[PDB]
Design a protein around this ligand. Structure first.
Ligand SMILES: CCCCCCCCCCCCCCCCCC(=O)OC[C@H](COP(=O)([O-])OCC(O)COP(=O)([O-])OC[C@@H](COC(=O)CCCCCCCCCCCCCCCCC)OC(=O)CCCCCCCCCCCCCCCCC)OC(=O)CCCCCCCCCCCCCCCCC
Ligand SMILES: CCCCCCCCCCCCCCCCCC(=O)OC[C@H](COP(=O)([O-])OCC(O)COP(=O)([O-])OC[C@@H](COC(=O)CCCCCCCCCCCCCCCCC)OC(=O)CCCCCCCCCCCCCCCCC)OC(=O)CCCCCCCCCCCCCCCCC
Ligand SMILES: CCCCCCCCCCCCCCCCCC(=O)OC[C@H](COP(=O)([O-])OCC[N+](C)(C)C)OC(=O)CCCCCCCCCCCCCCCCC
Ligand SMILES: CCCCCCCCCCCCCCCCCC(=O)OC[C@H](COP(=O)([O-])OCC[N+](C)(C)C)OC(=O)CCCCCCCCCCCCCCCCC
Ligand SMILES: CCCCCCCCCCCCCCCCCC(=O)OC[C@H](COP(=O)([O-])OCC[N+](C)(C)C)OC(=O)CCCCCCCCCCCCCCCCC
Ligand SMILES: CCCCCCCCCCCCCCCCCC(=O)OC[C@H](COP(=O)([O-])OCC[N+](C)(C)C)OC(=O)CCCCCCCCCCCCCCCCC
Ligand code: SF4
Lengths: 165, 69, 72, 78, 182, 95, 315, 51, 105, 70
């Protein structure tokens, strides 16, 4: 049910993202889309680690650059329209009552949670967020995360050169 | 005393010299601090002037106004 | 960024108007605008006697009172 | 005792005239004061000692501050 | 004037009470609006935030009610630098001709209710530069003033007496009773 | 079918963000914000793929690192024209 | 699924929100009182009895004054910053270590880092929508210091998570059953005090929201209820930093009354450094956040990497 | 002192894990019997529905 | 997580209701030309800064770097010890060498 | 003098002591068990699921009296 609520909220924020043109308003629409995307990717998974990782990296880490650039880009304020708010509310109530009149068992995702797994599954009882993150720090896939940290340092070296400081 | 236990009975005799606990409550509610002092003067208008050199300079003399206001 | 450290601002002493041009946090230019507390003291001294113009100096530099009276 | 950068005359007193010490004891003392906030600890202790001081608030208008017999107030005709 | 009442006369007088209106209202709605206005005026007089508007010497006494002897903080009074967050503006100093639009703009950006205290003879009436070419003849020609503190550098008891007189004015404010009688 | 009921919505919103990326009624900042919108939809679809497998979800912070470096690269490209094209280049409707 | 779990979780969260808000009001009273006693002067008095309803005098005044706006036409963006600020300050408290179960936050440190990473967002919309150059300067300065010590705070808490072996906040209790972590992490205690006075704008890191170099950084146009919500959000952040100091370093001790006595003592310490220290500069604060604290963070994280490897062989 | 405290926490969680390993196979057998029974009723329900 | 959505929506609803009632309780006066003006001290009245932008970029690079330091507390009891130590020492040592090199240059 | 701070601080000690202690009463009222069941490990959630399967109140005990005589 709440997965369908997040579907409806993402649809509504995407169509208002298509409608609006003010750059900080699109930045605000992105920062409120990232929360719903984080929660909706939290519904399929065993545990909410990667939603937290996407949260710190994308919203609190990266989009603040977008919010700063779009804040200094536009001198003017938002022109709030009650027509777009009314249309968003109408399509939101329509999509929630459409989720009310729809069977939620067929519309639920087939991806297993931590409790949707079998009871006799030995690997699920060990430690939360342990076996999924294991391949980051084991042979031979540790070279990718070493290359990722090197890639981030090289990215900073690129950014200092292209902005010319 | 080293610890300061003997100021608690000074607070208690402040309460008894105020006229009870309710009178000490309305004295603390009206006058912003509770003090003891020798009654020096009474006006014709009903004010009461107290002096006590235990406190420091600027605070050793106080007026308590007439109780009709 | 042109900016006014105006008379309301507390780091200014209440009448200083610092029109300062800022490139980021650095101060590229800073022009002080004064005379917001100009009271016409020298025009008013000449219409009064010496002992009447003595209390002007108390109000001139008002954290140095007796030094100003001493100088006059 | 640090040496003087500028020789202090008889009628003057010099501030910030001490040389920076280079022996290892003074360097370790300044290093520990930098790392472990010793001078900030002294500032915090001096600040905290003023909570236990007597307040100087004179409680207006039941108690009024000192005046003088020469005091200038409302003009009046005798 | 009136003679202040002799204690023989004043012992027969009853207690005044906190409310200037009194509890002798007839209607229950009028009494409820009176007590709501009493609570609102108590909240307003319980914390007035004056603005850091110090033009000249008078302001050196203004910091002397910030000072530990007089201690304005136990009267609800604490300085605020922004004019939006402040209730009161204390005109403490000499308003000049270049200072007039700055004071008017700072007062106009302040939100209502707005009480103004004129501190010192330069603030009200012009004072010692009243016949000057570039001094406004008092701030009453520009900003509407509720309390006028008299002394050339007001003692700090007299400025705080003006603050207590402003608190008595705020306690005497009638808004909901006027709304019931409008 | 399976595509109609599952993971149909990330495709539709990906095409909507692609059309917002390339429309001539928008500007360059709108292109970059719609680009990070399709980055978010790509994360959604990639996580739906990666959760059919049990313990390969660690790839989600690899694509995140690459696309966040792409976004910082695009912002640093776009603001490098401030000292050359002026502050009015953000309102350009054409390239 | 049993419904009294939902009912009691709702009741406990609303009771937590109510008690946090009244403790915010009494924390403003405590700060005005003992901050006066930092100097010679007295605190609030003469309102009600002994100055106790002074924050209610603040609340009646701030909820009655005219809600002014930085521009007359469109000001709905002016509204959304104190709403989200108070929402985050009342929402961050859900990761408090409760021994009776309220929310089973197995990743509480990540939740705290998320709410701190929104702190930059609410202060950025506070700065931009107030339409003033002082407001934009204060918003940019606050975003600068908060993202400058966000990385440092993440590394410091990441070094602390190595001690307990997991991200569960209640695991701070079991590793503090014999001694507190104030003994073992005293330079980390000083660094964490410098961190917690940087994300929340206090006097040692006050170039963002001071009354000297700016008149006010991002509260310059906020008044008449918006300033009240912002003030309550900032003091709730102070209360959260006091609690989070008392969980990590001092023993969690959630039930004991000594834990809340220590929480009031760390709030007293926050008001104690409010009156003592001067304010840092922009260049010196970029020097502090990116070189000294970052180098200490990575170095002593290496120290706990070596120590947790050394204990893993011995155990 | 932290090493001693971590040793105490380690022996507590090893005690809890050993208790979990004791409790586990009875619950596995109960899940096995209910899973086989529910598979039988699911096959019967699918057979009667799809006639 | 479903209870967290309910309590966050309740906090948002309570704060919006409190602000709406504060806007009703606020004293409505006549709106003015000068009262709506943005506040500059006294007399009535910024470009892009690259240094703050590279501060945000350094924050972003270190944030994505911290997001790879985050998992290894859990993995320490469930991985090869030599590989984990080599990657952790190499990770923080290359971070420290890069920080010191960017300090010196 | 300086003991006027303790009106403003001890109240802070009381109010923040409220949201646990009242729950330590309140979980003893409607549940009967003072502590709600910890949902951190998956085994605790499975055994809580087993209790709520066995009885409609998961905190109600199935002791040795449930076992039939044999
Ligand atoms: C719609 C309905 C109305 C809404 C608006 C109400 C506004 C109320 C405020 C106001 O302005 O009232 C003025 C209004 C006018 O008062 P007045 O008649 O002019 O003055 C009374 C006396 O002449 C002069 O007053 P007084 O000298 O008698 O002192 C007043 C008060 C003492 O003063 C106070 O109590 C002031 C408050 C101090 C609070 C300190 C702790 C704060 C903690 C915060 C957390 O005295 C008492 O309460 C009696 C003695 C108590 C002794 C207690 C000893 C304990 C040991 O007051 C009233 O009408 C009073 C009755 C209504 C108030 C509420 C009563 C019921 C609730 C009581 C508290 C329950 C908890
Ligand atoms: C039974 C049926 C009775 C009749 C029902 C009739 C319904 C249709 C007619 C009303 C209508 O929609 O008028 C459109 C009329 C035109 O609005 P608009 O130009 O499309 O956009 C609103 C402006 O941007 C707003 O520009 P602004 O910045 O001057 O807005 C002032 C702001 C002032 O906001 C407040 O005072 C709200 C205080 C904070 C609330 C909590 C945070 C949000 O007002 C609002 O936000 C209104 C809500 O909107 C309203 O009258 C809004 C209230 C409904
Ligand atoms: C649900 C609220 C939707 C608000 C909204 O879309 O407002 C329209 C405005 C649109 O701003 P705009 O200035 O880009 O408007 C262009 C779009 N038309 C003309 C169709 C309205 O968006 C905002 O004000 C954004 C507010 C923050 C949203 C998060
Ligand atoms: C609905 C709630 C209505 C009552 C709200 C609380 C009002 C308390 C109040 O104003 O008390 C201060 C005022 C008096 O305090 P004051 O602030 O006016 O003056 C303090 C006294 N001096 C200046 C001498 C130090 O109380 C009253 O007027 C009577 C209060 C009766 C009880 C009200 C409820 C108390 C809880
Ligand atoms: C902890 C948070 C607490 C928040 C609330 C704190 C205060 C609560 C107690 C005081 C309530 C005050 C209510 C009125 C506030 C506005 C006063 C005002 O100017 O009203 C004028 C208005 C209109 O009067 P008017 O006719 O003078 O207004 C015309 C406009 N001016 C001012 C420019 C002339 O009064 C009313 O609308 C009357 C309201 C009566 C009911 C009050 C509320 C009761 C429930 C609470
Ligand atoms: C507006 C949003 C403000 C910022 C909220 C950040 C919350 C942390 C990010 C996140 O994904 O948290 C996962 C968390 C779930 O954390 P979790 O899954 O680790 O915790 C397990 C859940 N309990 C504690 C109940 C056992 O979800 C949320 O915080 C939901 C946020 C809802 C926001 C509603 C308004 C939009
Ligand atoms: S009134 Fe007197 S003390 Fe005040 S500013 Fe004028 S000259 Fe100075």
């Amino acid at each position: 049910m709440i997965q369908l609520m997040l579907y409806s909220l993402i649809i509504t924020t995407s169509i208002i993202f298509l409608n609006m043109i003010h750059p900080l308003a699109l930045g605000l629409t992105l920062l409120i889309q990232t929360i719903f995307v984080c929660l909706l990717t939290g519904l399929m998974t065993k545990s909410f680690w990667y939603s937290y990782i996407l949260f710190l990296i994308f919203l609190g880490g990266m989009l603040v650059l977008f919010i700063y650039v779009t804040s200094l880009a536009s001198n003017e304020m938002f022109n709030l329209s009650m027509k777009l708010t009314l249309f968003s509310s109408l399509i939101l109530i329509f999509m929630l009552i459409l989720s009310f009149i729809m069977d939620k068992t067929s519309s639920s995702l087939f991806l297993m949670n931590n409790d949707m797994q079998s009871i006799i599954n030995m690997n699920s009882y060990f430690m939360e967020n342990s076996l999924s993150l294991n391949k980051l720090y084991n042979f031979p896939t540790n070279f990718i995360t070493i290359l990722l940290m090197n890639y981030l340092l090289i990215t900073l070296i690129v950014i200092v050169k292209i902005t010319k400081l | 005393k080293f610890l300061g236990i003997n100021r608690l009975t000074k607070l208690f005799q402040m309460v008894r010299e105020a006229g009870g606990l309710k009178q000490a409550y309305l004295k603390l509610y009206r006058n912003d601090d509770l003090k003891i002092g020798t009654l020096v003067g009474i006006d014709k208008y009903g004010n009461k002037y107290f002096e006590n050199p235990y406190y420091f300079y600027g605070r050793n003399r106080w007026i308590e106004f007439a109780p009709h206001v | 960024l042109t900016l006014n450290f105006g008379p309301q601002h507390p780091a200014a002493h209440g009448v200083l108007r610092l029109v300062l041009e800022l490139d980021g946090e650095t101060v590229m230019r800073a022009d002080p605008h004064i005379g917001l507390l100009h009271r016409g003291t020298e025009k008013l001294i000449e219409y009064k006697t010496y002992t009447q113009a003595l209390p002007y100096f108390d109000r001139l530099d008002y954290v140095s009172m007796m030094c100003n009276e001493q100088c006059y | 005792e640090p040496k003087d950068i500028v020789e202090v005359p008889k009628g003057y007193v010099y501030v910030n005239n001490k040389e920076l010490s280079m022996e290892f004891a003074d360097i370790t003392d300044r290093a520990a004061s930098t790392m472990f906030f010793g001078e900030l600890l002294r500032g915090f202790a001096v600040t905290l000692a003023h909570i236990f001081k007597e307040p100087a608030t004179i409680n207006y208008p039941f108690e009024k501050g000192p005046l003088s017999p020469r005091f200038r107030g409302e003009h009046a005709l005798r | 004037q009136q003679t202040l009442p002799v204690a023989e006369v004043a012992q027969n007088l009853p207690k005044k009470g906190y409310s200037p209106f009194g509890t002798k209202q007839s209607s229950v709605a009028e009494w409820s609006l009176a007590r709501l206005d009493d609570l609102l005026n108590w909240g307003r007089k319980g914390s007035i935030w004056p603005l850091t508007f110090g033009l000249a010497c008078c302001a050196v006494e203004m910091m002397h009610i910030a000072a530990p002897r007089y201690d304005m903080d136990r009267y609800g009074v604490v300085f605020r630098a922004s004019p939006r967050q402040a209730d009161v503006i204390i005109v403490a100093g000499t308003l000049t001709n270049k200072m007039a639009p700055a004071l008017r703009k700072v007062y106009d950006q302040m939100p209502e209710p707005r009480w103004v205290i004129s501190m010192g003879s330069c603030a009200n009436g012009g004072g010692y530069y009243h016949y000057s070419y570039s001094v406004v003849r008092g701030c009453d020609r520009i900003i509407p003033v509720d309390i006028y503190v008299p002394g050339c550098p007001p003692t700090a008891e007299a400025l705080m007496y003006g603050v207590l007189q402003l608190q008595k004015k705020v306690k005497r404010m009638k808004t909901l009773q006027m709304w019931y009688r409008k | 079918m399976i595509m109609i009921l599952y993971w149909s919505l990330p495709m539709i919103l990906f095409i909507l963000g692609l059309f917002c990326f390339v429309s001539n009624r928008k500007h360059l900042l709108s292109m970059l914000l719609s680009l990070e919108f399709i980055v978010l939809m790509l994360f959604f679809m990639l996580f739906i793929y990666l959760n059919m497998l049990n313990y390969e979800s660690y790839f989600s912070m690899m694509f995140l690192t690459f696309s966040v470096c792409e976004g910082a690269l695009g912002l640093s490209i776009l603001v490098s024209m401030i000292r050359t094209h002026g502050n009015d280049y953000f309102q350009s409707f054409s390239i | 699924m049993f419904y009294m779990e939902f009912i009691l979780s709702l009741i406990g969260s609303l009771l937590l929100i109510i008690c946090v808000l009244v403790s915010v009001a009494f924390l403003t009273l405590l700060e005005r009182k003992v901050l006066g006693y930092i100097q010679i002067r007295k605190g609030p008095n003469k309102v009600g009895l002994m100055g106790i309803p002074q924050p209610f005098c603040d609340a009646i005044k701030l909820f009655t004054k005219e809600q002014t706006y930085p521009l007359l036409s469109n000001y709905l963006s002016y509204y959304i910053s104190p709403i989200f600020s108070l929402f985050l300050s009342l929402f961050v408290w859900m990761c408090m270590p409760f021994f009776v179960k309220l929310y089973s936050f197995n990743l509480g440190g990540l939740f705290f880092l998320c709410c701190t990473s929104l702190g930059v967002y609410t202060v950025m919309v506070a700065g931009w929508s107030s339409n003033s150059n002082y407001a934009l300067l204060g918003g940019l300065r606050a975003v600068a210091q908060t993202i400058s010590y966000e990385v440092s705070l993440a590394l410091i808490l990441l070094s602390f998570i190595f001690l307990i072996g997991s991200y569960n906040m209640i695991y701070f209790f079991f590793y503090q059953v014999y001694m507190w972590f104030l003994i073992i992490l005293f330079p980390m205690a000083l660094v964490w005090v410098s961190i917690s006075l940087a994300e929340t704008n206090r006097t040692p890191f006050d170039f963002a929201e001071g009354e000297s170099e700016l008149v006010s950084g991002f509260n310059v146009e906020y008044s008449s209820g918006g300033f009240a919500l912002i003030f309550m959000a900032e003091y709730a952040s102070i209360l959260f930093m006091s609690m989070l100091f008392c969980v990590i370093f001092l023993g969690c001790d959630v039930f004991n009354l000594l834990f809340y006595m220590k929480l009031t003592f760390i709030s007293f310490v926050f008001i104690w450094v409010r009156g003592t220290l001067p304010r840092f500069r922009y260049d010196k604060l970029m020097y502090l956040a990116w070189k000294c604290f970052l180098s200490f963070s990575l170095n002593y994280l290496l120290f706990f990497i070596g120590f947790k490897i050394l204990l893993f062989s011995l155990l | 002192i932290y090493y001693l405290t971590a040793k105490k926490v380690k022996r507590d969680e090893i005690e809890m894990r050993s208790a979990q390993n004791v409790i586990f196979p009875i619950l596995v057998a109960e899940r096995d019997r209910e899973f086989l029974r529910q598979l039988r009723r699911n096959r019967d329900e699918e057979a009667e529905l799809m006639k | 997580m479903f209870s967290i959505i309910f309590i966050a929506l309740l906090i948002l609803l309570i704060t919006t209701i409190v602000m709406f009632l504060a806007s009703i309780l606020s004293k409505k006066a006549l709106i003015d030309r000068e009262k709506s003006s943005p506040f500059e001290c006294g007399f009535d009245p910024l470009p892009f800064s690259l240094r703050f932008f590279l501060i945000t970029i350094i924050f972003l690079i270190f944030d994505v770097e911290i997001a790879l330091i985050l998992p290894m507390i859990i993995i320490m009891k469930y991985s090869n010890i030599m590989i984990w130590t080599i990657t952790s020492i190499i990770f923080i040592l290359i971070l420290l060498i890069g920080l010191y090199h960017e300090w010196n240059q | 003098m300086w003991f006027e701070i303790l009106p403003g601080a001890v109240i802070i000690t009381t109010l923040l002591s409220v949201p646990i202690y009242a729950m330590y009463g309140l979980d003893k009222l409607m549940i009967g068990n003072a502590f709600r069941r910890n949902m951190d490990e998956r085994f605790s959630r499975v055994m809580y699921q087993r209790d709520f399967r066995l009885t409609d109140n998961p905190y109600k005990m199935n002791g040795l009296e449930q076992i039939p005589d044999e």
